[PDB]
C-alpha cells in the first residue's frame, strides 16, 4: 500500500471549509447553552435559599420547605424525561457515544428541551449530579441540529459536528478546553475503528465554546486551591499506593452504580408515576441534606478547596465520603438527568485527602501537605471507573493549575487504571452503552 | 454490527500484561539513554568552551579553534550516518512514523549507536538542532530492540512498543510527559487507519522515562519564564492575527527546508566525502557563530527566557530571527542527525516577541507584556509547519507553566494551522516521509 500512503500523506489535514465554519457555530451555540444552563441552576438554588429564609424560625417547616421545594423540582425533571425523551436520562455521554457509533439516534428536537429544562430541575434542586452530562448531550444534539438545519452530508460532517458539540460541552462545563478535546480523542470517539472526525474542527468548537463561557464567567474560577507544595522523588511511591487503592475501588463502585440502576428499577417497575414519585423523594432528600449537611449533597465543588486545604477532620472526611457515595448512587442510578463525572471528582478529592492525612502522620520526614494527595486523587475515580485517565489528569490540571504535581497525578491515575483493569472492571460509559444496546435487541 | 460492538465494549481496555510490563522497561531504557545523550552533549559544549580559554588571546586563533573543534565534531557525526545508518540522518521522526506504517525498517543494531554518537557530534559542536530528533528515533529503536530480545509477537506489541519508545523519547527531551503521549496520539500514529497501539502502555513508558529524567535533572528547569500576566478577552483578536502570520509563514518555511535538502544535495551529489566535508563547514560555521553571536546558533533554549522578558531590542530580534532561519535550514536540511522541532520553538518565541513589542506600542490601553505573545508564538511554528498544534500547545504549557495564557496559545495555534492549510502547506514530517517513500519506488 506504499503508493496509496504516499497519496494520503500528501493530502493530510485538509478538513473541508464547510465543516470548519460549522464547527465554529456549533461551539458558539453550545457555549451559550451551557452558560444559560449554568445560570439557571444557580438561580434555582438561590430561590431555594431565599425560601428557607421566610421560614427559618419553624425548624420543622424549614426542613419541610427544603424537601418539598427540591422534590417538586426533581419530579418535574424526571417527568420531562420519562414523557418526551427517555434517552435524556442519566448522563447522556453513553448516548452520544452510541450516536458516534451510529447505533443511537440524536433526537435533538426532543432532547435539547428535555435535557436542558430537565437538568435545571434535578441540578437546581441540589441533587448530587454534574453539569457535564447535560452539557455533553445537549452539545451533541446541538451538533446534529446544525447538521440538519444546513443539510450537510457525509460521514465526516455527522461525526465531526457531533464530536465538537460534545467537546464544547465538556469544555464549557468545567472551563477546560484541553479536557474537552482530549475527552473526544481518548474516550468518546469510536473505540474500535477509524473515524473521519476532524481534530482541527473539534478544536475550533471548543475555543468558541470556551470564549462564550469566559464572556459570562471571568474573574471567578470553578475551583481555587492556590499553589500547593512540590513533590519530592522519594515521595512518588506514596502516590502509586493511592492509585492502587483507587484501582480496586473503581470497579466496585461501577458495580454499585449498575446494580443500583437495577435495584431502583424494581421499585417503580418502569412506571412513569412511581418513577417520578421516586425521584421526588430522592430530590427531597437532597434539598434537605442540603440544609442539614451540605457536604453530603449537591455538585460538591464547594467542598473541594476546603478538603484540599486540610480543613476537614478525618472523621468528617470519612462521613462525607460514605454519605456522598450513597447520595451519588441514589441520584445517578435513579435515572435523573445529569452527570456522575463531577461527583466523582468530589469523591476522589475527599479520598485523596484522607490518604494524605495518614501519609502526613506516618512520614514527618517527607514534609507532606494533605492537599497534594487530594489533587492526585481528584481525577483518580475518573481514571479507575470511567477509564479516561489522560482526560481526568488534564482536566484536574486545568481546574487546579498545580503543574508541579504532574508526576504524582499521572502515577495515581495510571495505577488506578491499571488496578481497575487487573481486578476486572470496565469503562463505565461503555458498560452503560453496552447494557442499553443489549436491551435494544433482547426485545426480539 | 450491534452484536460485534456490544462484545467489543465489554472487552475495552484490556492491554496484555506482557505489553504493559515491556512498556515499562522500554521507557526506563529510553529515559536513561536520553539522559546520557543530554549529559554527553553538554560535556562536549564545555570542552569546546574550555578550549577557547587556552586561546582567548589570539582572536584569530580563537576563531579558528572554535571552527575546527566544531568542524571535527560535525564531520564525525555526518560520517557515522552516511557510513553505517543513512536513515539516522536529519530528524528521524519521519522514519519512526514510517515504521509505524510498516513501511520502514527499525534497524536498531545500527541506529542506536549511530544516532546516539552521531548526534553527540552535531549537537555537541553547537549546531542549530534539537535533541528530540535523536531521542525519538533512539527511543523507537529501543522499542524494537526489546520486542526482538524478548521475541514478543503480534501487531499490537510491535506498534505499541515502538510508539511508547518514541513518546518516552519526546518526554525525556523536554521533561514533558503529556506532550510525549499527545505527540503519538495526534502526530505519529498511523494517520489513515485504525491501530492496536495501547494508550495505557504508552502512558507507562512515558512515566518511567520522565522519572529517569528527574532523577538526573531535578531542581533545574529547561525554560524558566516566570509568571507572566493574564490576557483580557478584548485582547484575544491580537493572538488570532499572530496565528495568521504564523499560518502563512509555516508552509513557506516548509518549502525552504525541503528545497534546501535538494539544493544541498547537489553540492555533494551524494558522495560521502564531499558530504562529510560539507557538514564540517556547516558545523564549523556554527561553533564559530557560537562565539561571535551565540543567539544565531545552538539549540536556542537559552535565548527563550531572554526574549520573553522583552530584554532584546526589536533590531536584535529581527537579526536573530533571520540569522536563525538561515542556520536552522543549513543544519537540518544538510542531513545532520538532530531535530528541527526545538529550533522551531526558538523561532516561534522570537517572532512572537517582535509582534508583542509592536502590540505593546499600538495599544497602551491593553496594558500588554511582550512576553505573552512570545509564549503564544512559541508553539506556533510547530503548529503551522509540522501541523501538530495540540502537541505544540501542551508542550509549551508544560515547559512554561503559564496556564492563564491557554486561550491565546490555542488561538494562535489554531490560526496557524488554519492558514497553513488554506495556503496549501503540508505537515512537514509527512512531506519528508512521503518524499522518502517516493524515492523508494523510483
Amino acid at each position: 500500500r506504499r503508493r496509496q500512503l504516499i497519496r494520503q500523506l500528501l493530502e493530510r489535514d485538509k478538513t473541508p471549509l464547510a465543516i470548519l465554519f460549522m464547527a465554529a457555530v456549533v461551539g458558539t451555540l453550545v457555549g451559550l447553552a451551557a452558560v444559560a444552563f449554568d445560570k439557571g441552576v444557580a438561580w434555582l438554588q438561590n430561590q431555594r435559599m431565599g425560601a428557607l429564609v421566610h421560614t427559618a424560625d419553624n425548624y420543622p417547616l424549614l426542613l419541610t420547605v427544603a424537601f418539598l421545594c427540591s422534590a417538586v423540582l426533581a419530579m418535574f425533571g424526571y417527568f420531562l424525561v420519562r414523557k418526551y425523551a427517555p434517552e435524556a436520562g442519566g448522563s447522556g455521554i453513553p448516548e452520544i457515544e452510541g450516536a458516534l457509533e451510529d447505533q443511537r439516534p440524536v433526537r435533538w428536537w426532543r432532547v435539547l428541551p428535555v435535557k436542558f429544562f430537565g437538568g435545571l430541575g434535578t441540578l437546581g434542586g441540589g441533587m448530587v449530579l454534574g453539569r457535564e452530562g447535560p452539557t455533553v448531550q445537549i452539545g451533541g444534539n446541538i451538533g446534529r441540529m446544525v447538521l440538519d438545519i444546513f443539510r450537510l452530508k457525509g460521514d465526516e460532517a455527522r461525526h465531526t459536528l457531533l464530536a465538537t458539540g460534545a467537546a464544547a460541552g465538556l469544555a464549557a462545563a468545567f472551563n477546560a478546553p484541553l479536557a474537552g478535546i482530549l475527552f473526544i480523542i481518548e474516550e468518546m470517539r469510536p473505540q474500535f475503528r477509524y473515524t473521519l472526525i476532524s481534530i482541527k474542527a473539534v478544536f475550533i468548537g471548543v475555543i468558541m465554546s470556551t470564549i462564550m463561557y469566559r464572556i459570562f464567567n471571568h474573574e471567578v474560577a470553578l475551583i481555587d486551591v492556590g499553589k500547593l507544595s512540590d513533590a519530592p522523588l522519594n515521595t512518588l511511591w506514596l502516590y502509586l499506593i493511592l492509585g492502587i487503592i483507587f484501582g480496586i475501588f473503581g470497579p466496585i463502585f461501577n458495580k454499585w452504580v449498575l446494580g443500583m440502576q437495577d435495584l431502583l428499577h424494581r421499585v417503580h417497575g418502569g412506571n412513569i408515576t412511581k418513577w417520578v414519585l421516586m425521584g421526588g423523594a430522592i430530590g427531597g432528600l437532597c434539598g434537605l441534606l442540603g440544609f442539614v449537611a451540605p457536604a453530603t449533597s449537591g455538585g460538591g465543588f464547594n467542598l473541594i478547596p476546603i478538603a484540599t486545604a486540610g480543613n476537614f477532620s478525618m472523621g468528617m472526611l470519612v462521613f462525607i465520603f460514605v454519605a456522598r457515595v450513597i447520595t451519588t448512587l441514589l441520584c445517578f442510578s435513579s435515572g435523573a438527568p445529569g452527570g456522575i463525572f463531577a461527583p466523582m471528582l468530589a469523591l476522589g478529592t475527599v479520598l485523596g485527602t484522607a490518604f494524605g492525612m495518614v501519609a502526613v502522620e506516618l512520614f514527618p520526614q517527607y514534609h507532606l501537605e494533605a492537599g497534594t494527595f487530594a489533587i492526585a486523587g481528584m481525577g483518580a475515580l475518573l481514571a479507575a471507573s470511567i477509564r479516561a485517565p489522560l482526560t481526568g489528569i488534564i482536566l484536574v490540571l486545568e481546574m487546579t493549575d498545580n503543574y508541579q504535581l504532574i508526576l504524582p497525578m499521572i502515577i495515581t491515575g495510571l495505577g488506578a487504571t491499571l488496578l481497575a483493569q487487573f481486578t476486572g472492571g470496565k469503562p463505565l460509559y461503555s458498560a452503560i452503552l453496552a447494557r442499553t444496546l443489549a436491551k435494544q435487541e433482547a426485545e426480539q | 454490527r450491534r452484536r460485534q460492538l456490544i462484545r467489543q465494549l465489554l472487552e475495552r481496555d484490556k492491554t496484555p500484561l506482557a505489553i504493559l510490563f515491556m512498556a515499562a522497561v522500554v521507557g526506563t531504557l529510553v529515559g536513561l539513554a536520553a539522559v546520557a545523550f543530554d549529559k554527553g552533549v553538554a560535556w562536549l559544549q564545555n570542552q569546546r568552551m574550555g578550549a577557547l580559554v587556552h586561546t582567548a588571546d589570539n582572536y584569530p586563533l580563537l576563531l579558528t579553534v572554535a571552527f575546527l573543534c566544531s568542524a571535527v565534531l560535525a564531520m564525525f557525526g555526518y560520517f557515522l550516518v552516511r557510513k553505517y545508518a543513512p536513515e539516522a540522518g536529519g530528524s528521524g521522526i519521519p522514519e519512526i512514523e514510517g515504521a509505524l506504517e510498516d513501511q520502514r525498517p527499525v534497524r536498531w543494531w545500527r541506529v542506536l549507536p549511530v544516532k546516539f554518537f552521531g548526534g553527540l557530534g552535531t549537537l555537541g559542536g553547537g549546531m542549530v538542532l534539537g535533541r528530540e530528533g535523536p531521542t525519538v528515533q533512539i527511543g523507537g529503536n529501543i522499542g524494537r530492540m526489546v520486542l526482538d530480545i524478548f521475541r514478543l509477537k503480534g501487531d499490537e506489541a510491535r506498534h505499541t512498543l515502538l510508539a511508547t519508545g518514541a513518546a518516552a523519547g519526546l518526554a525525556a527531551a523536554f521533561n514533558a510527559p503529556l506532550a510525549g503521549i499527545l505527540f503519538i496520539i495526534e502526530e505519529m500514529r498511523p494517520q489513515f487507519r485504525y491501530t492496536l497501539i495501547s494508550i495505557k502502555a504508552v502512558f507507562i513508558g512515558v512515566i518511567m522515562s520522565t522519572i529517569m529524567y528527574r532523577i538526573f535533572n531535578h531542581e533545574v528547569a529547561l525554560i524558566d519564564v516566570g509568571k507572566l500576566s493574564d490576557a483580557p478577552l478584548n485582547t484575544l483578536w491580537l493572538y488570532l492575527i499572530l496565528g495568521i502570520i504564523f499560518g502563512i509563514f509555516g508552509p513557506i518555511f516548509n518549502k525552504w527546508v525541503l528545497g534546501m535538502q535538494d539544493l544541498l544535495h547537489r553540492v555533494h551529489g551524494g558522495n560521502i566525502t564531499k558530504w562529510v566535508l560539507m557538514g564540517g563547514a556547516i558545523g564549523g560555521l556554527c561553533g564559530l557563530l557560537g562565539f561571535v553571536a551565540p543567539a544565531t546558533s545552538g539549540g536556542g533554549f537559552n535565548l527563550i527566557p531572554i526574549a520573553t522578558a522583552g530584554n532584546f531590542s526589536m533590531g536584535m530580534l529581527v537579526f536573530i530571527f533571520v540569522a536563525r532561519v538561515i542556520t536552522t535550514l543549513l543544519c537540518f536540511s544538510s542531513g545532520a542527525p538532530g531535530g528541527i522541532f526545538a529550533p522551531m520553538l526558538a523561532l516561534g518565541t522570537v517572532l512572537g516577541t517582535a509582534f508583542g513589542m509592536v502590540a505593546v506600542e499600538l495599544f497602551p490601553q491593553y496594558h500588554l507584556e511582550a512576553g505573552t505573545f512570545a509564549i503564544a508564538g512559541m508553539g506556533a511554528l510547530l503548529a503551522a509547519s509540522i501541523r501538530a498544534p495540540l502537541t505544540g500547545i501542551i508542550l509549551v504549557l508544560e515547559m512554561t507553566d503559564n496556564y492563564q495564557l491557554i486561550l491565546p496559545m490555542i488561538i494562535t495555534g489554531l490560526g496557524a494551522t488554519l492558514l497553513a492549510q488554506f495556503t496549501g502547506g503540508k505537515p512537514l514530517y509527512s512531506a519528508i516521509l512521503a518524499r522518502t517513500l517516493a524515492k523508494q519506488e523510483a
Partner: antibody
Amino acid sequence: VRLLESGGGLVQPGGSLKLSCAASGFDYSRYWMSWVRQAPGKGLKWIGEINPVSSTINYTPSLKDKFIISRDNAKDTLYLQISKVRSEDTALYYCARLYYGYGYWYFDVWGAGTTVTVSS
Amino acid sequence: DIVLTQSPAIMSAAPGDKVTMTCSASSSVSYIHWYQQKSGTSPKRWIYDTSKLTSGVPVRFSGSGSGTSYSLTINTMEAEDAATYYCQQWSSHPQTFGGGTKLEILR
C-alpha cells in the same frame, strides 16, 4: 486590603516632593498601580501608571521629569515625585490599584489620598 | 484626549424617584466605568463595563449606553445615594473622567 498614601503637605513653588503609597492585603507585584489627583472641589485627573516590573511607565501629557512614578515591589510601596511645583499641583493625590473585566481598565481600589499644598 | 461631559452637574431628587444621569464623549468610547464618591470619602468603583455592578452595589443601580452616550440609572433612589458620581473611559488612551454629577436629596 488597603492603600495608604503619605508625604503630603507643604512645598514651596518650583520645589519638588515625594509621595509614597503603602499597599497591603494583596499581592502588590503583578498589579499595575496608578496615581490620580483631585484639585480642591474639582474632578479626577489621571497622573500616571506603572506596570508590575516598571518595564512600562505611562504619564499624562506633562513636561520633562514633571512626574516620576516608581515602585519598590520589595516593600510594596508606590512612589511619585513632582518637580517644578506650581499651584496646579495643589490637589489631593490618590494611589490606586488597577484592574479590568473585559479589557478596558478601571481604577479597582483607591486609597484615602494624601494632600499636597503649594504655598510659601 | 476623549472629553467626558456628565449631565446635570447637579441634581435634586426624592427617595422613590427613578434617577438618571448622563455621560457624553467627544468621540466614541466603550465599556465605561462609574465611581461613587460620598462626602469625605475616596471614589469607589461602582459600575464597570458600562453595566456591570461591583460587588455590594445594590440592585437599584444600573448602567447602560454606547457610542457617545452613556447613562447611570437609580431605579428608585434612596437617601443614602447622596454622592458625586464620576464616569470614566479607557477604551482610548490616556483615560479620562467626567466632571461629575452631584446628587442631592430632597426630604
